[PDB]
Amino acid sequence: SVTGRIVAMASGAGRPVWGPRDTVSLMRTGFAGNPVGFRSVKLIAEATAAVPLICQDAERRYVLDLLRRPNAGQGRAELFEALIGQILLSGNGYLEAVCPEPGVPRELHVLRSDRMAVVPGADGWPVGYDYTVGGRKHRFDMTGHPDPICHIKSFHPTDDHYGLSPMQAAAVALDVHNAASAWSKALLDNAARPSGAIIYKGADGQGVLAPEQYERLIFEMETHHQGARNAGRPMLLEGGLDWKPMGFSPSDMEFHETKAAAAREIALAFGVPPMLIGIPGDATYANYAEANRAFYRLTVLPLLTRVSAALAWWLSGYLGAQIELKPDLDQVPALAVERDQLWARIGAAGFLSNSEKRVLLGLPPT
Amino acid sequence: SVTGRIVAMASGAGRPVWGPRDTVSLMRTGFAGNPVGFRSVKLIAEATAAVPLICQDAERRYEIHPVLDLLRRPNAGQGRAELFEALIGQILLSGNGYLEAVCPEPGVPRELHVLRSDRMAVVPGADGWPVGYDYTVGGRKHRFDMTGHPDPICHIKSFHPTDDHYGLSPMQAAAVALDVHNAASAWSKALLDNAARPSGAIIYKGADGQGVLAPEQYERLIFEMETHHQGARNAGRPMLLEGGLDWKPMGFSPSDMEFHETKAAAAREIALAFGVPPMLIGIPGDATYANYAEANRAFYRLTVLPLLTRVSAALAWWLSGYLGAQIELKPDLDQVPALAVERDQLWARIGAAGFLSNSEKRVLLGLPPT
Amino acid sequence: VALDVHNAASAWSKALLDNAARPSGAIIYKGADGQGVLAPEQYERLIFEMETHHQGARNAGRPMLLEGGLDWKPMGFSPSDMEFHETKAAAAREIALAFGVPPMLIGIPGDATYANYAEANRAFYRLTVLPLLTRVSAALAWWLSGYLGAQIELKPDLDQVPALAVERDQLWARIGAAGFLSNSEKRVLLGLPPT
Amino acid sequence: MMLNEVTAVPGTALPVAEFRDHLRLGTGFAGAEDAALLSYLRAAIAAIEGRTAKALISRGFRLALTAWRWGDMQTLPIAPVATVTALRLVDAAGVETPVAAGWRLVPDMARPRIEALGAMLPMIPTGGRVEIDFTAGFGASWSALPVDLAQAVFLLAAQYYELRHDGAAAMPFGVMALIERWRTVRVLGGRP
Amino acid sequence: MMLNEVTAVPGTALPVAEFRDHLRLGTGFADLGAEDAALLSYLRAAIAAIEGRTAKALISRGFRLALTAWRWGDMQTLPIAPVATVTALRLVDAAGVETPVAAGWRLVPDMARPRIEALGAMLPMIPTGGRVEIDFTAGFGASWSALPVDLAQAVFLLAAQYYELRHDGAAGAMPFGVMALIERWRTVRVLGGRP
Amino acid sequence: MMLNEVTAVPGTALPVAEFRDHLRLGTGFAGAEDAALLSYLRAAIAAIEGRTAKALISRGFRLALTAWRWGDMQTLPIAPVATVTALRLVDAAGVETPVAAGWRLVPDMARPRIEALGAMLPMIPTGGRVEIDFTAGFGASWSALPVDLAQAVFLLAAQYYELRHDGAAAMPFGVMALIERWRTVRVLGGRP
C-alpha cells in the first residue's frame, strides 16, 4: 500500500493496461484446436464445478441460493464451468454482480477476460475495469466498498495485474501437437505414392507411346493388373518396357513420439495426470483410484479453494457478516481412498472411547 | 446485464448470427464417416439416456410428478430414451441443445421436440439476451419469441470461451484427428483397390535391345504360364528360361502398416476429445484403466454425469417456468450400475465401522431411518 | 542450463514442423538434353494428371506410366520421430530435480522410482515442502513477534495433512497393537488429550 | 488454355542484317539470301522462347482458358509482360462482353500474374471461357533485348546455318549456359 | 519486381580500341575499323553474360526497381550488387500521380547484400493497387578504367571466344580462366526458406 | 561493408619493364607495347589479391561498415596491414567527426584486426556508419614483395599474354601451388 504510490505512477495512472496480446489466439488454437488442450480444461472446469461448498464463519454450516441460481441463463455448474474456463485459459476470472437491492446481489455474470482490462489509478488496487467490445467501453468503478467485480488471479511472478494461465506456459507444446497432427493430416491429403511405374524408354533414349498404344496400355493395366482381385499377375514386359516398383519407406509414425510427448506436456501444465484424459505412455499411477485422488488434490482442490475464497470475501461485502466458503473435501467420490483408511485408522484404535472418535471423523457426538 | 447493451450491438441486434461454418459438414465426415467418432457419441448419448432422474422440491416426494409424466413420454413416437439420445446427440455434435415445447394449456407443455442445431440460429437482441431463434429449413424462417415468461426453448450450451452464443462440440476440437482417421482408412481402401503388384515379370528383350514376341509366341507363352506356372497348385515350377527370356521377381516392399500407428493414435484422440476411455469403445492400445470396473466408473464420472447433470439442470429451470413451484432434476447416482465399486467401499466402510449405532449409519448411507 | 535445453528442444520440434520441406517424391524431367524445362502446355498437363489422379489418400498406389525422359524419384524423411526426444525428457527431469518434485507427481514419463503415490506424495511433503514451509513460518514467527510483546512460534501442523497418512497409519498401528502399556499412556504418545 | 499469338513477327523487326555480321564478318568471306537467314533466326528464337518461356520481340498474345487456377492468381506463362489489353469474357455464342475492372496486372519477370483486386476474380460462365489478350515481350525492336539472350539466338542460328543436318561438332558460356538464367525455375508439381 | 534499366551503356565507354589490341588483329593498316560494329557487339554480349552470372553491373548505368509489395519488413535487398546513390524512391498509387518520399530509407552500401534498411522500423507503406519504383545507379564506375581488373579481364577472355568461334562449338580451362575469375564476384546465398 | 580503395596503383609502380624480362629474355626473341603488358599484370595482381585476399602494392583502402562484429574485434579483410590512418565516425549527414583513441591496430598476417582497448569499442550512431581508412599491402614498390608471390603474378600474367582466349595447354610449384600459402584459411562458417 505504501509501495502503491510508486508502482501505479510507473505503470500509468488512470489508464487501461491491456497486458497479453495473444490471450485469444491461444484460445482458438489451444482449446478449439487440439483435443488435449480441449479435454484438460474441460476436465478441470467440470470437476471444480462438481465439488459442493459449505458456509462457515456463521458458527454452523448453513447466499447459497445465489450460487445455485445466479441468473436466467447459466446454472450453478454452468457458472463455474465458465468461471474456471477463463482462469485456466487466460489466468483471470471476472464476476459482474448486479445489485438493485443493497445487499446480496441478484445475478452473477462471468465477464469474459479477453475483452476485459484493468486500470490501476493513483494508488494500490485497480480503480476500474473496462469491458471493451467493439470500440465501446464500460468503466466499472472500484472506488467504494461493494466493488462490483471480483478479480480472481492465478499466480504471476512478473506482472502486477493479471494471471499466467498454464496454456501460456505450454504454448510451444500446443504448437507441436497442432502441427504434428496437421503433418499427418496434410500428408494423407497431398502425397503421391505410386504402386510402381511402367517405364517406356523406347528405341531411343526417350520415346512416348502412341495414343493407340496408351489406350491399350491402360486397358491391360486397369483390367488385369490393378485391384485386390489382381494381386500377382506376372506382367509380361516386352522389349523396352520395364516395371520399376516404387516403395514408400517412411510409412507409419511421422512425428509420432514428438506428438505424444507434446500431448503430455500439455497435460503437464494444466495439472491433469495422463491416465485421466487418455494419453498413452508409461503407467505412473496404478489403478485410477490414486490417479483420481491425485487429480482432486494437486490441481482441483488447490484451484477451487482459491476461487471460493475470493467468492467468500467479495460476496461478504454485500451482506454485513463476513462469510467463509470453502470446498467440503468430503462427499466427493475421488477422496474415498483417503477417507476409508482414515475410518479404518481410528476405527480400529479401540483404546479411545466412542465419543472421542466421532469428533475425529467430523461426526456430531450423541 | 449492465454490460448487455454493448455486447449485443456489436454483432448486430435483431439479425441472425449463424455460428460455426462446418458443424454441418463434420456430422457427415466425422460421425457417419469413421467408426470411432460414431461410437464415441453413441456410447455417451446412450449412457446419459440410461441414467434415471430425481424430481425434488424440499421433500423429494414427486415420483408421480407431471414433469416425470412429461419426460416419460415426451411426444408421439419418441420415448424418454429416444429423446435424450437425440438431445445429447446434438450437444456432442454441434455444442447446442434445443427443446421446442407446445402448450395448449398454459402449464406443463404437452410435447418436447429436440430441434436440431444445424438449422437453428440465434438473435442477439437488445440486452445481450437472444430474443429469437430462427429455425431455417430450406429458405424458410420460424422465429420463436423469447420476450415472455415461459420462453419456449431451453438452449443447452457447452462451454465456449470465445463465442457468446454457442458451444464448442468436442467433434469440432478433434476435427484434425477425424481427418487423419478418415484419410488413413481411405489410404488402405484405395491401396487395396488401385495398386499393382505383380508376382514377377518375364523379360523378353530378344536378339535386339528391344523386341516384342510374335502372336504365335504370345499365346504359347501365356499357355505355359497360365496352365503350368500360376496358382497355388504350381508354387515352385523350375521354369526353363531359354535365350533372351528372364524372370525378374517383383516385390511389395511396404506390405503391412500403411499409416497404421498414426491411425490408431488418431483414433485415440477422437476418443480423447469426447471423453470415452479407449477400452470402452475398443481401441487397441495400452491398458490405462485396469478391469472395466474402473473405466466404466471413470466413464460415468468424467464425461457422462458431468454432462447429464447440466442438461437436467437446464430442464430443471426451463420446465419450472411452466409450473409455479421450482423443480430440481439431477441424476440419481444410485442404482446406476457402473458406480457399484464406488458404492461397495461406502457400504464396507460404514458397515464395518461398528462404533456408531444402526440408526446413525442409515442416514450416512441414505436410508429411511427406523 | 537444463531449462535452456528443454526450451530449445521443444522449439526444435516447433520449428521443424513449421519450416521443413519433405516432398513425397519428385518427378524428374531431364529431357532430350541434359537439362530441359517442360512447356507451359506440358506443365498444366503434368499437374492435372498429378493433382487429380495421383495425389491424396484416395489415390495411394496409381501405377504411374513414366514415358521417356520422366522419372519419379521418391524422397524420404530419414529422422522422422525423436528429435532430441531423450535429451528433452532427461532435461525435463533435471528441472524437476532442482525444485525437488518427484517426476510421478507432475507427470514426467520415466522409470518409477517411487511406487504408488502414497510414497511419492509423502516424499514430496518431507523433502521439499515441509522443509521449505517450516522456515518461512520460522521467519514469520520471529518477525511478527516483534510486533506483539509475547514471542510467537509458527510451524506446520504435521497432522491432518493428507499426504502423511501412511506415516500416521504405522504410528497408530504400532502403538495401537502394543497392548502392554495402558490407554492413558498411549494417548500421550499419539498426541491426544489424556482422560 | 491455348495461348495462340495474335500476329507473327514481321521479319523486318528481326535482325537479318546484323546476323550476317555475326555470321561472316571480321573473320571469313564477305553467301545465302535473306530468306535463308531469316528462316534460321526465327527457328532459333522459337527454340529459345520455348526453352526459356519468353517472347523476345513483344508481339501480342491471346490466352483463352476455361477455369482460373486461384481467385487471386492465374500466372501467365509468357514471362516479360506489359499492358494486358483486354479481359474479354465471352458467353456461349459470345456477343463478346469485355470487363474493365477488378484485376491488376503485376509486371514481374518471375511470375507474370493477373492478381484480382481484393479476394474475388471475374468468374466464368458455363461454356463461355475467358480470353486474355496481352502483349508480352522485351521490346518492339531487337535492340531492346538483353544482350546475352540476343547472343544465344545468334550462337544458335549460326549453328542451324553452318551445319544442316543433325551432325557432330561445350564452351563456357555457350547456348545452354546463356539461356539457363532466363528459364523458369519452378518446383511445384503439386495440387496448388 | 521487374528491374529494367533506364538507360543503356552508350557504346563509347566500351574499350573497343583496347579489345582490338587484345585480339591481335592488326596494327598499321588503312582499314583498322572493319570490326568496330563487331568487336563492340561481342563486348556487350560478354559484359551482359557476366552480369547474369555475378549479378553485377560494371558500367554504372541507372536502374529502376518497379515492385508492388515489400519483401520483408524493412530491408529490401536490391538484386544488382554494387550500388551507390539511390536517386529517387517514389511511391505510386492506383493511377499515376507519383509522389516522391524521402521516406526514412537510407541504403546501406555493401557489395555483399545491397539493401535499403528502413530506419523508422517500417518501410513506407504501399497503396493498394500501386507500385514502388526505386531509381538507382548501380555499378562500379562510369568509365571502363574504374572496373576491378580481374573482372574486366574475364570480359576480354570471354568476348574473344565469341569472336574467334561464331557457332556453338565445343573447345581444359586455364588455372584462372573465365569461370575462375568471376567466381569471386558471384552471389553466395544459402537461403531457400520463408524468411 | 564495402571496402573500396582510395587510389589505384599508378602503373609506374608496376614492373612493366621486369615483366618482359620474364616474358621473352634469355630464351626467345628480344613484341607488344607497354599498355598491352600493363593490362595483364594488374589483371594478374587482381586475380591473386582476390584469391589470397592480399594487396601487394600497398595502396590505401576505405572500409565503411555499419555494425561491428564483436566489441574487441572486427578483423580487416585485406591481410598485410600497416598504419590505420583514421577512424572516422560519421553521423547521418556527416560533419564527419574522427576519433583518435580507444583502439590498437595489431599488425598480423593471419587476422589483421582492430582490437579496441579494454572491453568497449567505439559505437556507431543511427545511420552514421563508421569508416576505416587503412593502407594495407607489402610495400610501396615491387621489390618489397615476397618473391614467390611476385613470381606467381608473372607466371599468371605470362599466361594471360601468351594465350588470349580460354584455350587449352600442372607443374610442381605452379600458379596455384605458389599462392596456396598466401590464402586465408578459415573454418568458421558459424554464428560468431
Residue numbers in the entry:
A (entry chain B): 24 to 85, 90 to 393
B (entry chain A): 24 to 393
C (entry chain A): 199 to 393
D (entry chain C), F (entry chain C): 1 to 30, 33 to 171, 175 to 197
E (entry chain D): 1 to 171, 174 to 197
Publication excerpt:
The dodecamer of the adaptor proteins provides the binding site for a hexamer of stopper proteins, resulting in a symmetry mismatch between the two complexes. Adaptor loops from two neighboring adaptor proteins differ in their conformations and interact with one subunit of stopper protein. The first adaptor loop is oriented parallel to the tail axis and fits into a cleft within β-sheets of a stopper protein, whereas the adaptor loop of the second subunit is wedged between two stopper proteins. A hexamer of tail terminator proteins (Rcc01690, g8) binds to the distal interface of the stopper proteins. α-helix 1 binds to the insertion loop of the stopper protein and α-helix 2 interacts with α-helix 3 from the same tail terminator protein. The insertion and short loops of the tail terminator protein interact with the long and insertion loops of the stopper protein.
Here, we use cryo-electron microscopy (cryo-EM) to determine the structures of RcGTA before and after DNA ejection, and to visualize the interactions of RcGTA with R. capsulatus cells.
